[PDB]
Design a binder for this molecule. Structure first.
Ligand SMILES: CC(C)(C)c1cc(NC(=O)Nc2ccc(-c3cccc4c(N)nccc34)cc2)no1
Ligand SMILES: [Mg+2]
Length: 286
């Protein structure tokens, strides 16, 4: 079921190398006729057989989980046994990169982003896939400000998590097994980052303090959000990072709570807001 693309090295060039969340080479590439795309590839070296093996599994996984909120595998390139993943380029980069820009992302658009992450996670969880590393770097964003979930390091993790987003139960044990509720925890911090427009815990002095603090109940600083954040999203953020994972809702639970709030309060202004973002980017940059 894997789409093998016939594309030679002469068809495209690497415009830039991006940080690849592990063993991969990730490149923004330009095709002679088809334009920008992302390739993940293997470096030459003594580890090429296990990496190439990992890349193929990555390709199979992305392929069987095709979905509007999962990063899109366009296909695979096979040159003398060596795989390259080709993927559809999400032009605005990751979610933190969007959040940190000079142009503020408006509430309703933040609302939709959140709704789309929930849809992505219901799907993965419905498929029996625990993400294990949900964070803003793994949420990619397109020119219409729709999002898709990526997992830059998950091909590296299976061949063998990020501190700020990790459920306390997994700081506790290196042999704790991630669950759906671990992803829900991560999602809570992502919710906070979406409204804080930055990473949490800036005042942490050291890793060991941070770990001890979070295990004891500390969470990102709700008072350090300086934009308006609806009571409902604050309430949901606090529910999703409860200490007891049994106290955290499922992702279908989150959809049940959130979508009615989105549809009645936020959805109305999204198309207009996206229109002015699109204008305040192509004028303020280009
Ligand atoms: C199904 C599930 C979510 C569990 C999953 C995903 C996965 N593999 C990847 O997610 N691979 C991957 C995704 C994105 C990129 C990339 C990096 C930098 C920028 C990109 C940009 N601008 N657009 C597009 C892509 C980009 C590189 C590799 N394996 O399982
Ligand atoms: Mg080339």
């Amino acid at each position: 079921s894997l789409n093998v693309i016939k594309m030679k090295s002469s068809d495209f060039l690497e415009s830039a190398e991006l940080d690849s969340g592990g063993f991969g080479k990730v490149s923004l590439c330009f095709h002679r006729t088809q334009g920008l795309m992302i390739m993940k590839t293997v470096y030459k070296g003594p580890n090429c057989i296990e990496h190439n093996e990992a890349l193929l599994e990555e390709a199979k996984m992305m392929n069987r989980l095709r979905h509007s909120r999962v990063v899109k595998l366009l296909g695979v390139i096979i040159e003398e046994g060596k795989y390259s993943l080709v993927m559809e380029y999400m032009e605005k980069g990751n979610l933190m990169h969007v959040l940190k820009a000079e142009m503020s992302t408006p509430l309703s658009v933040k609302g939709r982003i959140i709704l789309e992450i929930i849809e992505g996670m219901c799907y993965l969880h419905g498929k029996g896939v625990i993400h294990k590393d949900l964070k803003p770097e793994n949420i990619l964003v397109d020119n219409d400000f729709h999002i898709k979930i990526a997992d830059l390091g998950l091909a590296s993790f299976k061949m063998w998590g990020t501190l700020y987003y990790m459920a306390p139960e997994h700081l506790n044990d290196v042999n704790a097994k991630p669950t759906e509720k671990s992803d829900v925890y991560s999602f809570a911090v992502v919710l906070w980052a979406i409204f804080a427009n930055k990473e949490p815990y800036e005042n942490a002095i050291c890793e060991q303090q941070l770990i001890m603090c979070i295990k004891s109940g500390n969470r990102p600083d709700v008072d350090d959000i300086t934009e308006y954040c609806p009571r409902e999203i604050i309430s949901l953020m606090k529910l999703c990072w409860e200490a007891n994972p049994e106290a955290r809702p499922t992702f279908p639970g989150i959809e049940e709570k959130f979508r009615p709030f989105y549809l009645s309060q936020l959805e109305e202004s999204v198309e207009e807001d996206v229109k002015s973002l699109k204008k305040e980017y192509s004028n303020e940059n280009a």
